[PDB]
Write a protein that binds this ligand. Structure first.
Ligand code: NA
Ligand code: NA
Length: 157
């Protein structure tokens, strides 16, 4: 279903293909979105409450775990995020059979994509701000993209 995660420079001339994930998120809306990438830990409600950066109008990246993918997306949707990236921090191997179950059996309101940990680590290289020690995640974790960088998420259909 031809998915792609791309870091685009705000000068409009440079971009860097992070990953074209072979796996698709079942019931994700098919679209392309571009904006800031904000790390929201696991995407739980408390994670979003303790977040400094407003996710409204931004792509959020979350770790798999604690809650379903649908609940992560539903919280990001509620806070007016434009897209969601999901990755596992405990393995390099990609998420398989990623799935979104919503009331009414419909799709997400925003594009949702699973990415490998290597892909997440690449995004973190273009991101600033150490993640809180309380998250108990890899030292490569970063919070928000630098001002000169946006993430272009494309989920195909
Ligand atoms: Na940014
Ligand atoms: Na849940």
């Amino acid at each position: 279903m031809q998915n792609s995660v791309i870091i685009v420079d705000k000068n409009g001339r440079l971009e860097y293909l992070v990953e074209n994930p072979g796996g698709s998120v079942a019931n994700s809306k098919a679209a392309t979105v571009t904006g800031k990438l904000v790390h929201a830990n696991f995407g739980t409600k408390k994670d979003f409450e303790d977040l400094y950066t407003p996710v409204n109008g931004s792509i959020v990246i979350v770790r798999a775990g604690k809650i379903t993918f649908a609940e992560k997306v539903a919280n990001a949707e509620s806070l007016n995020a434009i897209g969601v990236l999901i990755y596992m921090d405990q393995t390099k191997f990609p998420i398989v059979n990623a799935e979104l179950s919503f009331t009414g059996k419909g799709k997400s309101g925003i594009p949702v994509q699973t990415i490998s940990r290597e892909a997440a680590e690449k995004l973190f290289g273009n991101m600033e701000g150490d993640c809180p020690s309380d998250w108990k995640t890899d030292s490569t974790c970063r919070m928000v993209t630098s001002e000169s960088k946006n993430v272009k998420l494309t989920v195909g259909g």
